Design a protein around this motif. Structure first.
Motif, PDB file in Angstrom:
ATOM      1  N   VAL A  93       8.254  41.815 -63.654  1.00 47.14           N
ATOM      2  CA  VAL A  93       9.642  41.359 -63.601  1.00 47.14           C
ATOM      3  C   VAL A  93      10.478  42.248 -64.526  1.00 47.14           C
ATOM      4  CG1 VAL A  93      11.080  39.269 -63.594  1.00 47.14           C
ATOM      5  CG2 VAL A  93       8.632  38.978 -63.361  1.00 47.14           C
ATOM      6  N   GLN A  94      11.746  42.485 -64.165  1.00 52.58           N
ATOM      7  CA  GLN A  94      12.696  43.301 -64.916  1.00 52.58           C
ATOM      8  C   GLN A  94      14.076  42.667 -64.739  1.00 52.58           C
ATOM      9  OE1 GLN A  94      12.198  47.224 -62.866  1.00 52.58           O
ATOM     10  NE2 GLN A  94      10.754  47.797 -64.444  1.00 52.58           N
ATOM     11  N   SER A  95      14.799  42.353 -65.818  1.00 53.62           N
ATOM     12  CA  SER A  95      16.204  41.927 -65.785  1.00 53.62           C
ATOM     13  C   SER A  95      16.797  41.934 -67.197  1.00 53.62           C
ATOM     14  CB  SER A  95      16.340  40.514 -65.196  1.00 53.62           C
ATOM     15  OG  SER A  95      16.373  40.606 -63.792  1.00 53.62           O
TER      16      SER A  95
ATOM     17  N   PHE B   4      13.319  33.584 -70.841  1.00 59.19           N
ATOM     18  CA  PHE B   4      12.006  33.054 -71.183  1.00 59.19           C
ATOM     19  C   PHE B   4      11.809  31.706 -70.478  1.00 59.19           C
ATOM     20  CE2 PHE B   4       9.353  30.437 -74.158  1.00 59.19           C
ATOM     21  CZ  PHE B   4       8.152  31.162 -74.074  1.00 59.19           C
ATOM     22  N   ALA B   5      10.989  31.686 -69.423  1.00 58.80           N
ATOM     23  CA  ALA B   5      10.766  30.500 -68.594  1.00 58.80           C
ATOM     24  C   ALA B   5       9.677  29.555 -69.137  1.00 58.80           C
ATOM     25  CB  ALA B   5      10.422  30.955 -67.171  1.00 58.80           C
ATOM     26  N   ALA B   6       8.909  29.976 -70.151  1.00 60.49           N
ATOM     27  CA  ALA B   6       7.722  29.327 -70.724  1.00 60.49           C
ATOM     28  C   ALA B   6       6.618  28.985 -69.708  1.00 60.49           C
ATOM     29  CB  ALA B   6       8.122  28.110 -71.573  1.00 60.49           C
ATOM     30  N   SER B   7       6.816  27.986 -68.849  1.00 60.90           N
ATOM     31  CA  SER B   7       5.830  27.489 -67.896  1.00 60.90           C
ATOM     32  C   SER B   7       6.506  26.600 -66.845  1.00 60.90           C
ATOM     33  CB  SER B   7       4.709  26.733 -68.637  1.00 60.90           C
ATOM     34  OG  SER B   7       5.215  25.838 -69.618  1.00 60.90           O
ATOM     35  N   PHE B   8       5.832  26.373 -65.712  1.00 62.34           N
ATOM     36  CA  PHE B   8       6.322  25.588 -64.582  1.00 62.34           C
ATOM     37  C   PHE B   8       5.125  25.122 -63.737  1.00 62.34           C
ATOM     38  CE2 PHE B   8       8.913  25.615 -60.390  1.00 62.34           C
ATOM     39  CZ  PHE B   8       9.714  24.512 -60.732  1.00 62.34           C
ATOM     40  N   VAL B   9       5.380  24.307 -62.713  1.00 54.58           N
ATOM     41  CA  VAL B   9       4.398  23.878 -61.724  1.00 54.58           C
ATOM     42  C   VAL B   9       5.096  24.000 -60.367  1.00 54.58           C
ATOM     43  CG1 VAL B   9       2.911  21.947 -60.959  1.00 54.58           C
ATOM     44  CG2 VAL B   9       3.207  22.355 -63.392  1.00 54.58           C
ATOM     45  N   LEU B  10       4.435  24.642 -59.402  1.00 55.97           N
ATOM     46  CA  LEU B  10       4.955  24.910 -58.064  1.00 55.97           C
ATOM     47  C   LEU B  10       3.757  24.992 -57.128  1.00 55.97           C
ATOM     48  CD1 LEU B  10       7.275  25.797 -56.077  1.00 55.97           C
ATOM     49  CD2 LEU B  10       6.808  28.140 -56.812  1.00 55.97           C
ATOM     50  N   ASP B  11       3.883  24.393 -55.941  1.00 56.99           N
ATOM     51  CA  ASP B  11       2.869  24.349 -54.882  1.00 56.99           C
ATOM     52  C   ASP B  11       1.472  24.003 -55.416  1.00 56.99           C
ATOM     53  OD1 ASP B  11       1.945  24.472 -52.133  1.00 56.99           O
ATOM     54  OD2 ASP B  11       1.333  26.543 -52.451  1.00 56.99           O
ATOM     55  N   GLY B  12       1.404  22.924 -56.207  1.00 53.01           N
ATOM     56  CA  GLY B  12       0.160  22.385 -56.751  1.00 53.01           C
ATOM     57  C   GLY B  12      -0.577  23.365 -57.670  1.00 53.01           C
TER      58      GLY B  12
ATOM     59  N   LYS C  74      -0.168  25.749 -61.497  1.00 54.08           N
ATOM     60  CA  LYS C  74       0.531  25.871 -62.777  1.00 54.08           C
ATOM     61  C   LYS C  74       0.882  27.339 -63.008  1.00 54.08           C
ATOM     62  CE  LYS C  74       0.401  24.283 -67.582  1.00 54.08           C
ATOM     63  NZ  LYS C  74      -0.349  23.558 -68.638  1.00 54.08           N
ATOM     64  N   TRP C  75       1.967  27.573 -63.738  1.00 53.87           N
ATOM     65  CA  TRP C  75       2.606  28.864 -63.914  1.00 53.87           C
ATOM     66  C   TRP C  75       2.989  28.957 -65.400  1.00 53.87           C
ATOM     67  CZ3 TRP C  75       2.968  32.051 -59.384  1.00 53.87           C
ATOM     68  CH2 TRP C  75       2.631  31.425 -58.170  1.00 53.87           C
ATOM     69  N   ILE C  76       2.817  30.114 -66.053  1.00 56.43           N
ATOM     70  CA  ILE C  76       2.909  30.265 -67.509  1.00 56.43           C
ATOM     71  C   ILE C  76       3.277  31.707 -67.920  1.00 56.43           C
ATOM     72  CG2 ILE C  76       0.364  30.610 -67.697  1.00 56.43           C
ATOM     73  CD1 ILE C  76       0.567  28.790 -70.298  1.00 56.43           C
ATOM     74  N   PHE C  77       3.819  31.863 -69.132  1.00 54.41           N
ATOM     75  CA  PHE C  77       4.068  33.134 -69.813  1.00 54.41           C
ATOM     76  C   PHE C  77       2.800  33.998 -69.932  1.00 54.41           C
ATOM     77  CE2 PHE C  77       4.217  35.312 -74.082  1.00 54.41           C
ATOM     78  CZ  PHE C  77       5.236  36.239 -73.803  1.00 54.41           C
TER      79      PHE C  77
ATOM     80  N   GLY D 124       8.540  42.441 -68.152  1.00 52.15           N
ATOM     81  CA  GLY D 124       7.397  41.629 -68.526  1.00 52.15           C
ATOM     82  C   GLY D 124       6.344  41.540 -67.438  1.00 52.15           C
ATOM     83  N   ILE D 125       5.215  40.974 -67.848  1.00 54.93           N
ATOM     84  CA  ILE D 125       4.076  40.620 -67.030  1.00 54.93           C
ATOM     85  C   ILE D 125       4.042  39.107 -67.188  1.00 54.93           C
ATOM     86  CG2 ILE D 125       1.613  40.923 -66.613  1.00 54.93           C
ATOM     87  CD1 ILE D 125       1.673  43.468 -68.375  1.00 54.93           C
ATOM     88  N   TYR D 126       4.128  38.367 -66.094  1.00 57.15           N
ATOM     89  CA  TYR D 126       4.443  36.951 -66.151  1.00 57.15           C
ATOM     90  C   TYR D 126       3.644  36.248 -65.073  1.00 57.15           C
ATOM     91  CZ  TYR D 126       8.236  34.827 -69.058  1.00 57.15           C
ATOM     92  OH  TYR D 126       8.958  34.202 -70.028  1.00 57.15           O
TER      93      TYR D 126
END
Length: 47
Positions: A5-7, A12-20, A22-25, A39-41
């Motif tokens: 990702v580049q912007s 800083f999104a920290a973490s999330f949950v999507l389509d069952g 988990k998603w994280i830094f 970043g690498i995310y």
């Protein structure tokens, strides 16, 4: 699976949950050669 990702906002999104799943830094830095964050995310999606 990670994303790359580049912007300028470096949101800083920290973490999330999507389509069952988990998603994280993992890593980010400011790429002074281009004047944006990069970043690498496993959650951020350029927003």
């Amino acid at each position: 699976a990670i994303k790359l990702v580049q912007s300028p906002n470096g949101n800083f999104a920290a973490s999330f949950v999507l389509d069952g799943t988990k998603w994280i830094f993992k890593s980010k830095y400011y790429d002074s050669s281009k004047g944006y964050w990069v970043g690498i995310y496993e959650v951020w999606d350029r927003k």
